[PDB]
Amino acid sequence: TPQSTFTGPIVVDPITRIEGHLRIMVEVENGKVKDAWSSSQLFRGLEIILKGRDPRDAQHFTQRACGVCTYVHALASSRCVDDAVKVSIPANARMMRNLVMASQYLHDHLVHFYHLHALDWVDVTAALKADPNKAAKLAASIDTARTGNSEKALKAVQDKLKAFVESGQLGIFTNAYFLGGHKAYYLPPEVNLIATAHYLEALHMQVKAASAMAILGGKNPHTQFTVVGGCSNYQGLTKDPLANYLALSKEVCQFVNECYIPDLLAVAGFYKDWGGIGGTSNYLAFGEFATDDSSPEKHLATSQFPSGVITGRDLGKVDNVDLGAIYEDVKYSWYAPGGDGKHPYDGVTDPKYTKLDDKDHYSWMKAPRYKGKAMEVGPLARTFIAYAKGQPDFKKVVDMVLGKLSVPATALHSTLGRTAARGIETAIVCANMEKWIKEMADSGAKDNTLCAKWEMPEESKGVGLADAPRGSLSHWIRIKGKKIDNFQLVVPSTWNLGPRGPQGDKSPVEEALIGTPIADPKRPVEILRTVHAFDPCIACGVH
Amino acid sequence: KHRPSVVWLHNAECTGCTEAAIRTIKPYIDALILDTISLDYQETIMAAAGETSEAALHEALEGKDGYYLVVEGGLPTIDGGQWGMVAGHPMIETCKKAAAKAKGIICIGTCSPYGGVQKAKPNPSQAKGVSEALGVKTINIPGCPPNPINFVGAVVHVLTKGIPDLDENGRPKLFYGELVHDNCPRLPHFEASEFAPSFDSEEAKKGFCLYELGCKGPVTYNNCPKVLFNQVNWPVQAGHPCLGCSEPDFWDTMTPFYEQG
Ligand code: SF4
Numbered sequence: 001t002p003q004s005t006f007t008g009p010i011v012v013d014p015i016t017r018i019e020g021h022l023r024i025m026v027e028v029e030n031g032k033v034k035d036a037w038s039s040s041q042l043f044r045g046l047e048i049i050l051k052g053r054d055p056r057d058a059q060h061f062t063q064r065a066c067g068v069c070t071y072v073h074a075l076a077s078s079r080c081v082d083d084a085v086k087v088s089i090p091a092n093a094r095m096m097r098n099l100v101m102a103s104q105y106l107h108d109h110l111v112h113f114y115h116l117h118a119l120d121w122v123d124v125t126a127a128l129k130a131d132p133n134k135a136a137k138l139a140a141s142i143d144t145a146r147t148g149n150s151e152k153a154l155k156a157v158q159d160k161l162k163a164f165v166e167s168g169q170l171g172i173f174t175n176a177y178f179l180g181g182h183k184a185y186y187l188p189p190e191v192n193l194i195a196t197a198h199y200l201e202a203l204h205m206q207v208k209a210a211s212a213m214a215i216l217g218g219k220n221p222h223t224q225f226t227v228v229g230g231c232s233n234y235q236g237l238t239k240d241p242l243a244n245y246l247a248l249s250k251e252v253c254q255f256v257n258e259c260y261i262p263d264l265l266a267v268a269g270f271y272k273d274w275g276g277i278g279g280t281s282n283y284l285a286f287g288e289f290a291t292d293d294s295s296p297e298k299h300l301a302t303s304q305f306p307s308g309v310i311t312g313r314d315l316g317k318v319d320n321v322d323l324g325a326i327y328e329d330v331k332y333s334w335y336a337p338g339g340d341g342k343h344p345y346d347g348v349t350d351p352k353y354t355k356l357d358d359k360d361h362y363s364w365m366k367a368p369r370y371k372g373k374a375m376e377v378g379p380l381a382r383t384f385i386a387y388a389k390g391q392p393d394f395k396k397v398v399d400m401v402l403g404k405l406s407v408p409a410t411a412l413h414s415t416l417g418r419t420a421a422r423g424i425e426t427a428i429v430c431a432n433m434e435k436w437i438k439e440m441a442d443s444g445a446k447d448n449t450l451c452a453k454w455e456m457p458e459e460s461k462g463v464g465l466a467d468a469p470r471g472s473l474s475h476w477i478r479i480k481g482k483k484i485d486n487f488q489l490v491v492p493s494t495w496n497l498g499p500r501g502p503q504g505d506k507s508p509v510e511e512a513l514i515g516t517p518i519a520d521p522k523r524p525v526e527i528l529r530t531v532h533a534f535d536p537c538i539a540c541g542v543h
Numbered sequence: 544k545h546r547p548s549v550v551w552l553h554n555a556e557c558t559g560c561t562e563a564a565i566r567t568i569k570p571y572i573d574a575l576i577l578d579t580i581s582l583d584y585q586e587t588i589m590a591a592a593g594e595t596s597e598a599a600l601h602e603a604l605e606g607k608d609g610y611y612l613v614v615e616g617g618l619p620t621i622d623g624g625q626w627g628m629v630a631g632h633p634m635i636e637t638c639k640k641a642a643a644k645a646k647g648i649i650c651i652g653t654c655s656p657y658g659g660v661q662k663a664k665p666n667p668s669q670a671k672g673v674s675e676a677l678g679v680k681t682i683n684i685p686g687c688p689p690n691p692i693n694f695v696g697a698v699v700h701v702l703t704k705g706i707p708d709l710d711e712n713g714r715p716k717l718f719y720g721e722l723v724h725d726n727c728p729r730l731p732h733f734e735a736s737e738f739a740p741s742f743d744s745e746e747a748k749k750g751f752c753l754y755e756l757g758c759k760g761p762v763t764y765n766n767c768p769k770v771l772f773n774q775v776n777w778p779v780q781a782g783h784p785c786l787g788c789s790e791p792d793f794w795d796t797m798t799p800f801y802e803q804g
């Protein structure tokens with residue numbers, strides 16, 4: 001609804017509350033975005049740095065592509081070399097690798113919703129205006145009954161914030177787009193207070209969630225338990241650790257349900273206008289939580305969170321992923337010419353910077369295209385594909401959401417949709433922990449086999465597939481001389497936030513940005529809302 | 544001011560160190576932020592964006608009373624430092640600025656301290672440590688990432704008591720004083736010459752030393768076995784060898800992670 005008459009360009013650099021360095025440049029006609037550019041600002045190397053190195057070392061270098069997405073790259077890389085090496089990891093390895101990823105989904109989506117996105121819909125300063133007693137009643141009407149949503153709990157939150165604000169040292173809230181009131185912020189002070197109480201709560205809950213992951217993963221950030229052939233964490237297979245793991249996980253899930261989801265639904269109710277802003281057509285998923293992780297084909301097919309490629313927004317046709325169809329162009333990217341259209345196994349990373357705001361060359365991320373088209377990857381892609389396939393859990397939850405929100409489903413094709421999807425699957429991963437944990441607790445107890453024997457090939461090639469918290473992740477390798485000849489990563493954020501392909505075709509984010517309403521060009525919260533819904537990770541994207 | 548002002552910079556990094564900072568308990572992140580310091584710039588969690596974020600930055604550095612500089616990530620040096628940019632400025636240029644009047648400089652992570660993974664061969668961006676780049680002594684809290692216990696520890700200590708005792712590579716001796724291997728609960732196996740030959744072998748299931756599998760704990764300085772991560776674990780206890788990540792240039796100095804040379 002709120003929208004200026006602003007005509008001219010606006011650029012947000014840096015895009016904060018995302019991982020990595022991103023510059024967004026849009027052209028606005030009468031308060032609505034008419035064109036957009038997604039400019040990734042830092043290049044590290046990684047793929048280049050890995051050339052000629054020992055295949056066993058790759059997981060360690062690639063895991064550093066990102067510290068938010070921790071483990072997923074070590075996983076993707078382990079699956080990749082397991083492929084080139086032709087090793088079939090044991091049952092317990094699959095269970096433990098898949099369990100750590102679930103733990104990661106848990107920690108990642110909680111932090112992203114509260115610490116990264118929330119500030120785009122919630123006005124923390126207006127939480128100062130709400131009466132705690134009136135707030136607690138609302139909390140008692142909209143959320144699960146919790147001692148944390150009490151009059152006194154909310155009050156203390158308000159008293160903590162108040163003092164801080166009245167200190168004059170605003171810190172991270174310095175210059176916030178919501179300071180002074182902002183026409184884009186609709187939530188009533190009561191909900192601003194509730195969300196802000198839960199924001200601080202999630203700072204503590206996320207510690208506890210990263211602690212559960214570290215039991216199985218060695219430590220967080222940057223797990224140290226996977227090895228070519230399986231895992232090395234024999235103790236993660238035992239009674240006490242698993243018991244503890246199960247405990248922390250349970251406690252993280254209580255928050256997901258009492259606070260996370262309710263909040264998400266709350267924010268969604270007030271901003272239903274966002275169910276019609278920033279949508280895309282194509283969705284891709286390599287899937288996750290597979291029952292037969294013995295090969296990429298067996299991963300795609302057996303994933304509890306299924307695979308598929310939805311084109312147009314044809315939810316009646318979820319096609320199968322053709323790994324040979326995936327490729328990446330470098331036309332509008334900061335790489336040497338000649339390399340547009342390379343399949344990962346033949347990828348080429350030749351950095352060649354030009355200048356800022358070139359339009360012809362504006363990002364360090366490549367432009368991954370599927371069979372000529374851009375693909376949105378991540379929670380919304382997963383939800384859509386999973387739902388289209390009749391995945392029970394997804395049906396229940398998506399319908400519970402579509403219902404409580406009284407919107408269609410066609411409504412998910414948007415920023416509001418993308419945002420809710422991330423929550424919807426958090427509720428589902430939480431729904432599966434006990435089950436998954438019991439399987440491994442039982443398998444481990446019977447036989448603790450965690451790593452298979454394998455042998456280094458002179459020449460080989462493999463691919464590691466995974467659907468990390470932000471989408472479709474694949475690590476491709478070409479072993480030659482028993483060393484790394486080529487190692488290429490095509491990451492979720494590269495799909496969503498890379499620039500245009502050689503056809504001049506926009507990426508998912510650039511497409512989602514068109515039509516974005518700017519209530520106030522000086523404080524463009526709307527741009528950030530769409531951008532954060534994608535959960536951008538520029539380090540992951542560029543590597 | 545009433546709370547000391549800390550300005551946090553992100554350069555060539557993975558954000559694994561901002562993530563590690565928030566894994567701290569004793570104190571928890573919010574406490575440190577609301578009660579102790581005044582984190583005035585931190586792109587990962589700051590509300591303002593775009594010009595507003597840079598205004599916030601400016602304000603911090605122009606602060607009536609100083610600031611402490613926390614640098615995360617190495618500096619992209621190639622092509623005038625243009626391969627790493629923020630607000631349309633090169634990262635070097637901006638650390639140069641912030642370090643200039645900084646009451647103190649704390650490098651969080653092996654990247655800022657010593658150049659990092661981006662500096663690993665062949666180092667396409669020609670990245671380097673904040674120290675090598677600026678040419679100033681910095682308080683290094685290495686690790687990939689460092690233990691929050693060590694970071695928060697150094698921050699607080701630097702704000703209260705002053706600059707801590709540093710070793711030859713700038714690491715507070717308090718944390719980077721003892722070899723990982725020296726506190727490793729697997730030392731008896733290492734002494735007894737009881738090594739795990741493979742991660743699938745019985746020795747590995749039995750908890751045998753991981754020296755044969757390339758454990759660099761013997762040449763690594765850090766408090767991981769003593770302190771643990773997340774109050775729950777650490778690499779060697781997860782049956783996996785130490786990569787020597789708290790060591791300078793470890794990416795090329797510890798390279799064949801699963802071999803001893
Ligand atoms: S030192 Fe490691 S964890 Fe820290 S930013 Fe660098 S690569 Fe990431």
Ligand code: SF4
Binds near residue numbers: 727733753759761
């Ligand atoms: S496992 Fe490693 S750090 Fe521990 S005793 Fe062995 S060589 Fe030392």
Ligand code: F3S
Binds near residue numbers: 686764779786787789
């Ligand atoms: S890999 Fe690093 S985290 Fe400690 S166990 Fe080793 S110095």
Ligand SMILES: [Fe+3]
Binds near residue numbers: 069491493540
């Ligand atoms: Fe990622």
Ligand SMILES: [Mg+2]
Binds near residue numbers: 366489
């Ligand atoms: Mg790539």
Ligand code: NI
Binds near residue numbers: 068540
């Ligand atoms: Ni990431």
